[PDB]
RNA sequence: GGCGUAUGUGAUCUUUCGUGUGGGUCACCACUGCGCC
RNA sequence: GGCGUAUGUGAUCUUUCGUGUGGGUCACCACUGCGCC
């Protein structure tokens, strides 16, 4: 179904009018959000990315330089103190550059992979807003790569590979590529865009990724490979993206030293795998439709007693499981077990554990997937070791399926 | 020494003028920042707190209601779209209340512990700024507790206890308490503040915490227990804090159902243990003075070869250790081992591993604390198991000290 | 936007009941769905 | 704010050297410290 509903459904979040296009991440939604971060971190570790964090706003003067002010100022939010006037960051590109500029960087510091779960803000037109897909305030999972241009290849490829290798974890079928070309208001010489565009295209076809030119689209600062995923109504949504920047690195004057002990402006690659935390979450919801894989489930397990007897043996287990590091909860409520199983199933809990008198003098637990498949009572540790296995591997399929 | 120095020193971060009072968290500082979160999360799990996340800004109209607009508007930042005009959040109190208002809450939903690593912004006077201690843009580790007033006690105590039990991890000696009373521009009836103040005080003395009234201080919305830690120049700095709110919950009209099936406005307790991520970090730096405990160390280990030979056996180990989940790095650079040991020691790496020909045909590693104590070569797994031990327990003392 | 409902939400009496909501009373519309203006 | 330096940063030749910086050349002031205006 529609994420917006499943969201209200599973208490993943909510939104209010006094905060248009601003998400009020509820506890459970958060968990998903958060759990995604840990995932990203994980994938990035291999490729050795640096995780930074930039200012929530900088001086308007800065953006004037980058170009944002002259071709984006309409989507930019702004405040100011007695001091100057600042823009709330739309992207984290400028920021990263600043951090890059501290000190003298040699070619040997390249390629420089700097990532950040950067919180952005954009004055998206009232009309264009939509659930977690198109919001005024989101969180990119981007990074920017500083590198020589011989590095551009391997560098871009690594990105691509990362997008697929990562999306694959969610088992996405529809992944269509687009290659947006020099937009109306760009900032580099055609000569630059020529190379930039070529480079990207070459990359695609060099990995045999089929695509179409998004002609007239793309960063005001460079060509842009777009990875689009689709939703409930098979509507296209841009999620991942790899952009080749030739201006900015110079505009904010960054540079490194070659062996020729010479000043060289680095090349800068923009890129976000999931794209935007809220948007990508929206898609996951859309896909699985409330059936987030065990690892990504707000609540992973539910242990319930049949009568007010085994209620202690339930607290017992919910405990052992909580230490096991499993998002578990106990439904000891005074209700018919049938009810419990109901509520939680439309709640989507990957696993439900029934504890009746029978199981108490067994140390066993009546296991049952949300899908309904009664997995039959089984050893405690057993369920744990197995759940952990399923979570640890962020596997999509549950036990016995 | 002064954090501001140690910071520039260990590349923990930097600041620029176009972004006054806004931190540019560099990779290694971030690590510390981040590692603190994981710590907070941890301590909060026990007490079962919900981790949400609110809007980076809401409608001015909202704050007019809470009171912020009429007695804080000066420290508040503001932007706006065609739509309305918003204030950048100073606190996350309002937000949390919004999230609390979704649905009908019964008394049984209480006490409601809602936490968030809420990113705040305040127009602190140019003059009052100072390193990480007093910034325009920081990250509170607060939460807000919704509860009946019989719960106020146990609730506040739980906070107190949390502050100590947590601070104790860092071995803080100077922890002085203050109890700020109804400020100039408050928002509740004296009658309310009377109770509010009393309550807090009772709490303190009930736990035998010595203190002094900060008369005239305290939230425009309630009394305020202050936990002050001291820095390099033994200057007082407010870190932890527990505030008893009696207005806001009603101002934003929140309520729960008693058994009397009746509408009751909840009592709300504000509270931040570390206080502010940046500030507390500042203090840690000041204290340890660049000697962050193993668990908190931007880099925990460094493995270096003596000659270009054992260089592979180094990549070897740095690997095994990286999988061990230890922030480790290899200094294979073409330099005298003595140099390496130097640089990294003033860099503060908790541990340095020398790998010479001798150790290559031993599988052993020449271990040596940053303090200098040569721990003598020892088994690899051995060092690992031991380091993990030290990290897992966030112990302050290193191996053999 | 307003009003009213309920297989909605909450309180509550009864029920103690083995796997998609047991029975009743009261409250409210904040969530969900349905009506009316 | 500007200028100049180096036990500062970078490049580089030499050095391969066992635990707080080996020797030289060049570059620059972005980091750190020191000077001058
Ligand atoms: C990739 C970054 O380094 C680059 N600076 C950048 O900002 N790229 S972007 O502007 O093309 O956006 C990256 C991704 O953010 C997400 N995103 C962009 N705008 C929004 C929005 N309004 N709401 C939600 N997600 C968004 C999309 O997944 C998009 O692919
Ligand atoms: C505790 C919260 O629920 C409450 N809303 C609140 O805002 N408390 S506060 O305003 O007293 O600040 C809490 C803590 O934030 C930190 N803090 C406040 N202002 C700043 C600042 N300008 N820079 C750095 N840290 C700050 C301090 O550690 C302070 O104790
Ligand atoms: Zn970018
Ligand atoms: Zn608060």
How would you portray this structure in words?
The structure is a homodimer of 401-residue chains. Chain A has helices at residues 3-10, 27-47, 60-66, 93-101, 152-167, 190-206, 248-251, 277-288, 311-323, 337-345, 357-360, 380-392, and strands at residues 50-51, 57-59, 77-80, 85-88, 105-106, 112-115, 119-121, 137-139, 143-147, 176-180, 211-212, 224-230, 236-245, 256-257, 263-264, 267-272, 301-305, 328-331, 351-355, 364-369, 378-379. The first copy, chain A, is an alpha+beta fold and 401 residues long. In chain A, the strands form 5 sheets. Chain A has an 8-stranded mixed β-sheet with strand order 1-6-9-16-13-12-10-11. In chain A, strands 18-17-19-20-21 form a 5-stranded mixed β-sheet, sandwiched between helices. Chain A has a 3-stranded antiparallel β-sheet with strand order 2-4-3. The longest helix of chain A has 21 residues, at 27-47. The structure holds 5'-O-(N-(L-threonyl)-sulfamoyl)adenosine (2 copies) and zinc ion (ZN) (2 copies). One zinc ion binds next to loops of chain A. The structure holds 2 RNA strands. Chains A, B: It comes from Escherichia coli (strain K12). Chains A, B: One of its GO terms (biological process) is threonyl-tRNA aminoacylation.
Biggest sheet details of chain A = 8 strands, mixed
Number of domain modules of chain A = 2
What percent of residues of chain A are in strands?
15-25%
- CATH class annotation of the largest domain in chain A: Alpha Beta
> Gyration radius of chain A, to the nearest Å?
24 Å
Q: Could you state the oligomeric state of the chains shown?
A: homodimer
What fold name goes in the CATH topology slot of the largest domain in chain A?
A: BirA Bifunctional Protein, domain 2
